[PDB]
Amino acid sequence: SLIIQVSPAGSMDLLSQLEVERLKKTSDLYQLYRNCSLAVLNSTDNSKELLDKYKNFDITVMRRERGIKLELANPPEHAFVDGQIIKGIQEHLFSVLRDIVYVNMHLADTNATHITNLVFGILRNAGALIPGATPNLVVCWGGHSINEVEYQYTREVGHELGLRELNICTGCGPGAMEGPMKGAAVGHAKQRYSEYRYLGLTEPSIIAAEPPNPIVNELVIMPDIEKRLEAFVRMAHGIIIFPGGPGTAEELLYILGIMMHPENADQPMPIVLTGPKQSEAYFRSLDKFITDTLGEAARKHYSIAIDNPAEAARIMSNAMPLVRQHRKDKEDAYSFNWSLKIEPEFQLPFEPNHESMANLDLHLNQRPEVLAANLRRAFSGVVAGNVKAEGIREIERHGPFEMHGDPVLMKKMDQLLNDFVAQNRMKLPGGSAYEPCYKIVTEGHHHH
Amino acid sequence: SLIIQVSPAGSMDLLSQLEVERLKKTSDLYQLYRNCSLAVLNSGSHTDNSKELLDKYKNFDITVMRRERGIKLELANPPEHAFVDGQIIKGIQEHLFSVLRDIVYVNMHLATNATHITNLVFGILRNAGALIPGATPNLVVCWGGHSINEVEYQYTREVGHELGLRELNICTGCGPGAMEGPMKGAAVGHAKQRYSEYRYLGLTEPSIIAAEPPNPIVNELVIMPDIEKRLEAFVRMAHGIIIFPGGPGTAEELLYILGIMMHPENADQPMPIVLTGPKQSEAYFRSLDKFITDTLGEAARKHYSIAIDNPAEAARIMSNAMPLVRQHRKDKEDAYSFNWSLKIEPEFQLPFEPNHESMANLDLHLNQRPEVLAANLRRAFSGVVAGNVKAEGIREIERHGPFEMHGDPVLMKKMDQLLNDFVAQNRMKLPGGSAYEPCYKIVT
Amino acid sequence: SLIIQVSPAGSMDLLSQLEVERLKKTASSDLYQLYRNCSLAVLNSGSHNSKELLDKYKNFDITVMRRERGIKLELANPPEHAFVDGQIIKGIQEHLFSVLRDIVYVNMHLNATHITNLVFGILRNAGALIPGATPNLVVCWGGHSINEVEYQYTREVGHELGLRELNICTGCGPGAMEGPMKGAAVGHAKQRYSEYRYLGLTEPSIIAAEPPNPIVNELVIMPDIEKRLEAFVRMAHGIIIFPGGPGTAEELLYILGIMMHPENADQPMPIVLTGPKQSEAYFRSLDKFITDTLGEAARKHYSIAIDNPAEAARIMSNAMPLVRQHRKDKEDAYSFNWSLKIEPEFQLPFEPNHESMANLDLHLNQRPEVLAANLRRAFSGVVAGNVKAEGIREIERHGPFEMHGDPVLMKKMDQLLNDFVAQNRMKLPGGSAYEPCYKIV
Amino acid sequence: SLIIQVSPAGSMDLLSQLEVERLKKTASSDLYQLYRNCSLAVLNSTDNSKELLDKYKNFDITVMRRERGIKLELANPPEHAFVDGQIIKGIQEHLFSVLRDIVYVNMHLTNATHITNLVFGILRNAGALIPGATPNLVVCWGGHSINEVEYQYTREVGHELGLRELNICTGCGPGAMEGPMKGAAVGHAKQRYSEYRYLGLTEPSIIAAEPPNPIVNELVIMPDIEKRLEAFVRMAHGIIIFPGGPGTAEELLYILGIMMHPENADQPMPIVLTGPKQSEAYFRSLDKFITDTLGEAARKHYSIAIDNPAEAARIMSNAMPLVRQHRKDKEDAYSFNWSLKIEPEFQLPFEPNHESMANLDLHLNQRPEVLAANLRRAFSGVVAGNVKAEGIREIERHGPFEMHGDPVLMKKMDQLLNDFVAQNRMKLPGGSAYEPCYKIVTHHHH
Secondary structure (H helix, E strand, O other), X not given: OOEEEEOOOOOOOOOOHHXXXXXXXXXXXXXXXXXXXXXHHOOOOOOOOOOOOOOOOEEEEEEEOOEEEEEEEOOOHHHEEOOEEOHHHHHHHHHHHHHHHHHHHOOOOOHHHHHHHHHHHHXXXXXXXXXOOOXXXXXXXXXXXXXXXXXXXXXXHHHHHHHOOOEEEEOOOOHHHOHHHHHHHHHHHHOXXXXXXXXXXXXXXXXOOOOOOOOOOEEEEOOOHHHHHHHHHHHOOEEEEOOOOHHHHHHHHHHHHHHOOHHHOOOOOOEEEEEOHHHHHHHHHHHHHHHHHHOHHHHHHXXXXXXXXXXXXXXXXXXXXXXXXXXXXXXXXXXXXXXXXXXXXXXXOOOOOHHHHHOOOEOOOOOHHHHHHHHHHHHHHHHHHHHOHHHHHHHHHXXXXXXXXXXXXXXXXXXXXXXXXXXXXXXXXXXXXOOOOEEEOOOOOOOO | OOEXXXXXXXOOOOOOHHHHHHHOOOOHHHHHHHHHHHHHHOOOOOOOOOOOOHHHHOOOEEEEEEEOOEEEEEEEOOOHHHEEOOEEOHHHHHHHHHHHHHHHXXXXXXXXXXXXXXXXXXXXXXXXXXXXXXXXXXXXXXXXXXXXXXXXXXXXHHHHHHHHHOOOEEEEXXXXXXXXXXXXXXXXXXXXXXXXXXXXXXXXXXXXXXXXXXXXXXXXXXXXXXXXXXXXXXXXXXXXXXXXXXXXXXXXXXXXXXXXXXXXXXXXXXXXXEEEEOHHHHHHHXXXXXXXXXXXXXXXXXXXXEEEOOHHHHHHHHHHHHHHHHHHHHHHOOOOOOOOXXXXXXXXXXXXXXXXXXXXXXXOOOOOOHHHHHHHHHHHXXXXXXXXXXXXXXXXXXXXXXXXXOOOHHHHHHHHHHHHHHHHOOOOOOOOOOOOOOOEEEOO | OOEEEEOOOOOOOOOOHHHHHHHOOOOOOOHHHHHHHHHHHHHOOOXXXXXXXXXXXXXXXXXXXXXXXXXXXXEEOXXXXXXXXXXXXXXXXXXXXXXXXXXXXXXXXXXXHHHHHHHHHHHHHOOOOOOOOOOOEEEEEOOOOOOHHHHHHHHHXXXXXXXXXXXXXXXXXXXXXXXHHHHHHHHHHHHOOOOOOEEEEEOOOOOOOOOOOOOOOEEEEOOOHHHHHHXXXXXXXXXXXXXXXXXXXXXXXXXXXXXOOHHHXXXXXXXXXXXXXXXXXXXXXXXXXXXXXXXXXXXXXXXXEEOOHHHHHXXXXXXXXXXXXXXXXXXXXXXXOOOOOOOHHHOOOOOOOHXXXXXXXXXXXXXXXXXXXXXXXXXXXXXXXXXXXXXXHHHHHHOOEEEOOOHHHHHHHHHHHHHHHHOOOOOOOOOOOOOOOEEEO | OOEEEEOOOOOOOOOOHHHHHOOOOOOOOHHHHHHHHHHHHHHOOOOOOOOOHHHHOOOEEEEEEEOOEEEEEEEOOOHHHEEOOEEOHHHXXXXXXXXXXXXXXXXXXXXXXXXXXXXXXXXXXXXXXXXOOOOOEEEEEOOOOOOHHHHHHHHHHHHHHHHOOOEEEEOOOOHHHOHHHHHHHHHHHHOOOOOOOEEEEEOOOOOOOOOOOOOOOEEEEOOOHHHHHHHXXXXXXXXXXXXXXXXXHHHHHHXXXXXXXXXXXXXXXXXXXXXXXXXXXXXXXXXXXXXXXOOHHHHHHOEEXXXXXXXHHHHHHHHHHHHHHHHHHOOOOOOOOOOOOOOHHHHOOOOOOHHHHHOOOEOOOOOHHHHHHHHHHHHHHHHHHHHOHHHHHHHHHHOOEEEOEOHHHHHHHHHHHHHHHHOOOOOOOOOOOOOOOEEEOOOOOO
């Protein structure tokens, strides 16, 4: 076996022996830590089977004179340039260790208050919440599987964000999770913005499929999908949304459900949907889905900017003084939006299985915010069925997840999902044809 | 009230509403937070080391406000000596945020006992940013009297200057005298040496901070929960120790480290200890050296040396020991900044609450293991400090007279003469008020 | 007028009144117009390779103001593409100060030793020679007018240089002058290399045609073409050369003629010619041109790497500790190569007119170094005639520059310039068809 | 020889061969000997004549252009530059400041304009002129030979300045050139002012006598005394003057002579004379000397604050907004006061000898500015005659420097100089009694 030593991290705190003992190869905690560290070294598909290709990989944590040193057994050779691990990948290994450790030390210490304080704590522990920072963070969302035209577009938006001294917070992995940071690197250099921040959020059951690029200079591993959604919207000062598949619709329905709450009517966070000229049909269909399901009231919470990278960035840049003023109006923090009201329906972690998917309430007779929360979960289930080990396994055992609801809505969701399949948004190129993991059915007398 | 706003200062993270909710003025915690904050503002020579301090600033209050760039502080009627031309000294501003950080962290961490204690001490120091993972060893703990004459003060300043010239940092208590002289010297030596990354760490705890407030020159103030945890923080962070003449607080510290260093499991620990003072302190040191060898045995002498009238040689012993310190931490697979492998037995950690009963119950006999006798003498000196300068201590004395101790008649007489010397040398209390009255009486 | 104030941006020292007097519009001196035109060019980056820049912005001016925190600049009617949302890009602001610093320096300070000492003085005063730096500067040369496939390959080589913590030194303008720096911004980001240096060197008679991208973070204005060439080769630790036109040809001949000097036999500076797969035929012909003219002895001084960006960057990276050893063996500086022997024929400033062009010694029958120095001139003549204002008017006055020599050399020559013309290397595309400024008999 | 290598320290640029070739040791090189002697003084930082050389006859220094710039080889350096066998870093930086500035002045080898521009050029090359910095620099002047009460007082003043985020620019050497910076090191640390600047200005013929302390973080070597004076007053945003001897008197006359020029009536820079309680008589007598000689008009240009270290610092701090507004009004730099009028009488370098001291115009019937210029030169000669090698030689071979002028003036000067001798300001303690290097001597009939 090839054994490689990773020297201590710039800025990783000393750990105690109690903090790290749960990580020995011995609880499934080691396997989870190993699997996240493997994903960071393996930064070329979304169906987990490279976790059969690195079976002999393992990682050992050593407490030493300057803090933690890591020993890697048989690491991916693509983490190397000229025999050395890329420094940004080195920093990600330490980020993985830090967050796994932190969460495991605070699994002990209402529940809605608990979840928000836990999200705040993880982010604060990661160094992601800079107290003195003026608002400038744009969350970017978009598909992992996008064409070259969409990809170049996300790169040019990132350039435009860079020229305006804005920072980027996004998911991890290929497609729209990687383009803007590459564009921002150039626009930040032109503008001499050396304090740039490219935050990449992930969680343990999706990191292998959507692994962090080395350019991400603040990686944070959140415990689950809902906590990462809540981290995105409490840190965001503005949000740009590119074309994407089910994961990107999920995010859109999460934020629109929150923003329709009357207590959030004065939250100024700008939301811009944007894409190249060729995405015009895609946005017409999305805009129509949203206002047909959630009503015409949802329209006030976002705008659409087609084929104009500088417009999206300018709308974000121009809103930063509005964000500043609103935070001071609420006696809130610039770096973490505590005053944003997030109802428990957006926090409750959702575990996609046949029963939970069939339990979803997709009828028109609810508050729109609540229909949004249920649609968020439906799209979360399609993602899971497609890419999470445990969700793919449910689909293997029992076939597709079945959903039902108002027939008009179900038809519209079924068409949206078929469009995602026709636009190749479900699967990166070069597997076999995509087989849907979902089936829309009509809602179903006793024997006596 | 005259409201003074204090902007965020130093490295202060955002806090949650839960973290600060008890620091509202309603709350025992608020009063503790308030007292520690007043102490850091009232940092000039009020001589007073008797906690009748507060009564001067009864209308003081502080409000913690969570705002856009983190916490701002609103002070109602702060002491004027915290000000230069109507602005608060920046070092005092940072100390207000250190107090808040440390009060908050300890309060959030209420949930085996020996392991819990050492892990708490580490956690507090880590939270304070006092444990730098990549730093090479260079931290010298300095101990010595809070009430010392000008010749002794000058000498501590010369040692600080020699530590500064050698790129050493200083960790010490708070308050005046030997807690401040060395950092003033070291400011000059470090500037000559261009050592802009100097660290002047000042450790305190809530029941002694009003009596011994941190100089604004301290650039890393840390509030520990109590005296024993401060002791543990000192000796786990130390790479070497310098001890100047002092009174009962300095005896307490010397006995603590000797008791620990005498444990057979610590035989390989390389940390050097140098007792040093000016030429005039020769008799003080002969008498102290004799008290240690007479009580703990000739074996204690192998853990320190004595350097009179030679500031450079004290600093040189520290500097020369650093490579052995490094090697030994590497041999132990231990951290440079926090000595986990040092064995500290429970009798060194168990918090001692001095009152007439606990002082009377101290086991003071010459037939004990010397490390165990050092633990009991540590507790006796801690009790003399508490009776002299702590609020609660000073009260027990007022309402019942001196603390009484008893034990081996031979030990009791040597102890009695040392305490008596501390009184004759003016080490028991800062001068400028009424003559010291013993808070102790040795019975038989 | 639109009037825009520029606050002090760089590491710009205080100046005296004496130092800026000649920049007043009232001074009887040509210096204001030079300073104005260099300042215009930096505000005109991204658009354009003809100096008829001047006609669209006739009403532009710039005023230097010595104030409390040093120099403030006032711009009257600046190009509006230097702006993002009403504000001049910060990199452009710093360039305006770099232009000021170097114009002032050269004006205050103004033979082999004198020339090299001047080049060193200029660089040192610009902050470009960092005394404590370990060798890692790669000079990149290549065509300002290139296709997408060549451009994308230059960005990939840049990304590979970034991942290996190498810095870039290059000319100014579009194409190969800007591609590597874009790639390196991403490779340096992955590698957390925050101290990156993107040096762009230029001179006043080409700056309007080839202006610096805002990404260049160390702009230096040299006084003339030959001093920029000398600056390149004394700072370089390695050299990467992409496909180019006559400007890249000129640079290649300059450095080959110097490296062939017996005194330079132990100068370790790696030279790597590189390009995408499609450039295979370009390089086969460039390779044959060099060896047919300078002889087989030139070949030991460069290699060719096609279709492999990582390889070019790995050769630069692997040579750095060689460069460190050789500088110490010569008791020389890391950051400025004094020990490099540059013969006066490579320093002597060449003024391209029909005469000096005709009086060039292009016989296939000289010292190889001495013929390289002559071809270097010829190529610089073809550049000047294409882009420099004074050159261009010599051609509008007397037609094409005429060159003659050994008919074996002259065929080779002509076919090379003809290949440049057909590969779209002479002129950025989309104006009046390129008509040659040269004629060969 | 014992050869100790010094690596690069501070912000020194690469130098060319041309720049350093004249610094090579040869039989005839006057420039090498000057460089060697300035370097040796920085390494030797306890009497005050320049026969301190003699202990270190075998010292030499070699400049070597190498990969990361210049490396220095010292032969037989003094032992007090070292702590535990390594050279104190501030001293290492000083060796390079000495090299930097000697090379610069030699490479830069109209007249009034010329001198001012050279002064600026030297300071800018040394990095002493920070373009973006808000005004905060206080020049401190004061005696090199002072008792413990006066020294502790200077230290208390430096602490107050430190607490106010003010910087210090001073001469080099012991006494009042040393105390304020030790006091400010403490004050600035309490205030977290890590960007502190302690500027020590010196010149080749005095640096041996008054060697810079390692705590100086910006050492600058000016070409001569007059250019150091111009450097002080152009960089100053305020001035504090402690009690001192003839060198301190020379500085006060220089600044008063300048500040009385009609073109300087708008200049806002404050001047505070200050010292401990026991210096009341000293300041009474100094203030009377000033107003008797230069006139009642001179009094408006300074104030006196006895026994109050915080007040002297407060005056400096409260004058900053005015100094900033006045610089902006004159379209001048914060860091270099070009607007200040300095007449040639203050710039012309003065070479003290028996003939130039006898040619001094010390008559009360002339412009008070030119009287001040002339008195400035006279104290300068007493300084030369006591501490400068060359001056000391003039006195060894020809006896004291004679001066004459108005008997009204001559008497005041005589008394003042007498007061300096009796207050032990001429000579640091140790050897024998001070012997005066001056004599004050006694046109009509027609």
